[PDB]
Write a protein that binds this ligand. Structure first.
Ligand code: HEB
Length: 123
Protein backbone atom coordinates (compact mmCIF):
# COMPACT_ATOMS: atom_id res chain seq x y z
CA UNK A 1 0.00 0.00 0.00
CA UNK A 2 3.11 2.16 -0.26
CA UNK A 3 3.37 5.07 -2.70
CA UNK A 4 5.61 2.99 -4.96
CA UNK A 5 2.98 0.25 -4.89
CA UNK A 6 0.54 2.79 -6.32
CA UNK A 7 2.66 4.18 -9.15
CA UNK A 8 5.05 1.24 -9.45
CA UNK A 9 8.00 3.46 -10.34
CA UNK A 10 10.42 5.79 -8.56
CA UNK A 11 11.02 8.26 -11.39
CA UNK A 12 7.24 8.58 -11.69
CA UNK A 13 7.51 10.38 -8.35
CA UNK A 14 10.29 12.71 -9.47
CA UNK A 15 8.22 14.00 -12.38
CA UNK A 16 4.88 13.86 -10.56
CA UNK A 17 6.36 16.08 -7.85
CA UNK A 18 8.44 18.22 -10.20
CA UNK A 19 5.23 19.07 -12.06
CA UNK A 20 3.46 20.25 -8.91
CA UNK A 21 6.51 22.04 -7.52
CA UNK A 22 6.96 23.95 -10.78
CA UNK A 23 3.32 25.01 -10.46
CA UNK A 24 3.59 25.99 -6.80
CA UNK A 25 6.46 28.25 -7.85
CA UNK A 26 4.30 30.24 -10.27
CA UNK A 27 1.94 31.01 -7.38
CA UNK A 28 3.96 33.70 -5.61
CA UNK A 29 0.97 33.99 -3.28
CA UNK A 30 1.60 30.85 -1.23
CA UNK A 31 5.34 31.42 -1.61
CA UNK A 32 4.97 34.30 0.84
CA UNK A 33 4.76 31.59 3.51
CA UNK A 34 7.72 29.61 2.18
CA UNK A 35 9.86 32.69 2.83
CA UNK A 36 11.22 31.44 6.15
CA UNK A 37 11.69 27.88 4.91
CA UNK A 38 14.43 27.14 2.38
CA UNK A 39 13.82 25.72 -1.09
CA UNK A 40 15.40 22.46 0.07
CA UNK A 41 12.95 21.69 2.88
CA UNK A 42 10.22 23.23 0.74
CA UNK A 43 10.17 20.40 -1.79
CA UNK A 44 9.85 17.96 1.11
CA UNK A 45 6.53 19.67 1.82
CA UNK A 46 5.12 19.11 -1.66
CA UNK A 47 6.21 15.49 -1.23
CA UNK A 48 4.53 14.71 2.09
CA UNK A 49 1.58 16.79 0.89
CA UNK A 50 1.08 15.15 -2.50
CA UNK A 51 1.27 11.87 -0.60
CA UNK A 52 -1.41 12.49 2.03
CA UNK A 53 -3.57 13.14 -1.03
CA UNK A 54 -3.71 9.45 -1.91
CA UNK A 55 -4.80 8.89 1.69
CA UNK A 56 -1.24 8.22 2.85
CA UNK A 57 -2.32 8.10 6.50
CA UNK A 58 0.89 6.18 7.19
CA UNK A 59 1.72 8.42 10.16
CA UNK A 60 -0.12 11.65 10.97
CA UNK A 61 -1.53 11.62 14.54
CA UNK A 62 -1.87 15.40 14.31
CA UNK A 63 -0.61 16.99 17.52
CA UNK A 64 2.60 18.16 15.86
CA UNK A 65 0.82 19.01 12.61
CA UNK A 66 -1.13 21.72 14.42
CA UNK A 67 1.83 23.21 16.28
CA UNK A 68 3.95 23.03 13.13
CA UNK A 69 1.31 24.95 11.18
CA UNK A 70 0.58 27.08 14.24
CA UNK A 71 3.93 28.84 13.90
CA UNK A 72 2.48 30.17 10.65
CA UNK A 73 -0.80 31.61 11.91
CA UNK A 74 1.46 33.40 14.38
CA UNK A 75 3.66 35.25 11.88
CA UNK A 76 1.86 34.81 8.56
CA UNK A 77 -1.83 35.69 8.40
CA UNK A 78 -2.86 32.30 7.03
CA UNK A 79 -6.52 31.91 6.04
CA UNK A 80 -8.95 29.54 4.34
CA UNK A 81 -8.88 31.01 0.83
CA UNK A 82 -5.23 29.97 1.06
CA UNK A 83 -5.97 26.26 1.48
CA UNK A 84 -8.39 26.34 -1.45
CA UNK A 85 -5.67 27.92 -3.58
CA UNK A 86 -2.99 25.25 -3.20
CA UNK A 87 -5.76 22.65 -3.24
CA UNK A 88 -6.90 23.82 -6.67
CA UNK A 89 -3.41 23.72 -8.18
CA UNK A 90 -3.34 20.01 -7.34
CA UNK A 91 -6.54 19.44 -9.31
CA UNK A 92 -4.98 21.08 -12.36
CA UNK A 93 -1.97 18.81 -11.86
CA UNK A 94 -3.92 15.58 -12.27
CA UNK A 95 -5.63 17.13 -15.30
CA UNK A 96 -2.26 17.41 -17.03
CA UNK A 97 -1.57 13.70 -16.59
CA UNK A 98 -4.78 13.10 -18.54
CA UNK A 99 -6.67 11.45 -15.66
CA UNK A 100 -10.45 10.99 -15.73
CA UNK A 101 -12.51 13.33 -13.55
CA UNK A 102 -14.29 10.61 -11.59
CA UNK A 103 -10.88 9.66 -10.21
CA UNK A 104 -9.92 13.29 -9.55
CA UNK A 105 -13.24 13.73 -7.75
CA UNK A 106 -12.41 11.16 -5.09
CA UNK A 107 -9.06 12.85 -4.50
CA UNK A 108 -10.81 16.08 -3.50
CA UNK A 109 -12.72 14.09 -0.89
CA UNK A 110 -9.58 12.81 0.82
CA UNK A 111 -8.11 16.30 1.14
CA UNK A 112 -11.67 17.57 1.59
CA UNK A 113 -11.45 16.32 5.18
CA UNK A 114 -12.91 18.75 7.71
CA UNK A 115 -10.36 17.73 10.34
CA UNK A 116 -7.22 18.38 8.30
CA UNK A 117 -8.73 21.76 7.43
CA UNK A 118 -9.63 22.53 11.05
CA UNK A 119 -6.01 21.75 11.94
CA UNK A 120 -4.74 24.50 9.65
CA UNK A 121 -6.85 27.16 11.36
CA UNK A 122 -5.92 25.53 14.67
CA UNK A 123 -9.10 25.41 16.76
C1 HEB B 1 -2.57 18.80 4.38
C2 HEB B 1 -2.62 17.59 3.41
C3 HEB B 1 -1.20 19.05 4.97
C4 HEB B 1 -0.42 18.11 5.55
C5 HEB B 1 -0.77 16.68 5.78
C6 HEB B 1 0.80 18.76 5.93
C7 HEB B 1 1.85 18.12 6.54
C8 HEB B 1 3.03 18.71 6.92
C9 HEB B 1 4.12 18.01 7.56
C10 HEB B 1 4.13 16.57 7.97
C11 HEB B 1 5.11 18.92 7.74
C12 HEB B 1 6.47 18.66 8.32
C13 HEB B 1 6.55 19.05 9.80
C14 HEB B 1 7.91 18.65 10.36
O1 HEB B 1 8.65 17.98 9.66
O2 HEB B 1 8.19 19.02 11.49
C15 HEB B 1 4.61 20.17 7.22
C16 HEB B 1 5.32 21.35 7.25
C17 HEB B 1 4.87 22.55 6.77
N1 HEB B 1 3.63 22.75 6.20
FE1 HEB B 1 2.21 21.43 5.90
N2 HEB B 1 0.79 20.10 5.60
C18 HEB B 1 -0.45 20.29 5.00
C19 HEB B 1 -0.89 21.51 4.52
C20 HEB B 1 -0.18 22.68 4.56
C21 HEB B 1 -0.67 23.93 4.05
C22 HEB B 1 -1.99 24.17 3.41
C23 HEB B 1 0.30 24.84 4.27
C24 HEB B 1 0.27 26.18 3.94
C25 HEB B 1 0.54 26.61 2.65
C26 HEB B 1 1.39 24.14 4.91
C27 HEB B 1 2.56 24.74 5.28
C28 HEB B 1 3.61 24.10 5.89
C29 HEB B 1 4.85 24.74 6.27
C30 HEB B 1 5.18 26.20 6.13
C31 HEB B 1 5.64 23.78 6.81
C32 HEB B 1 7.04 23.94 7.31
C33 HEB B 1 7.10 24.10 8.83
C34 HEB B 1 8.55 24.06 9.30
O3 HEB B 1 8.84 23.27 10.18
O4 HEB B 1 9.34 24.82 8.77
N3 HEB B 1 1.09 22.81 5.09
N4 HEB B 1 3.33 20.04 6.72
Amino acid sequence: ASLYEKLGGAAAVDLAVEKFYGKVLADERVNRFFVNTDMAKQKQHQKDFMTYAFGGTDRFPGRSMRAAHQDLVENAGLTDVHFDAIAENLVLTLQELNVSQDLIDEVVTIVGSVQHRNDVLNR
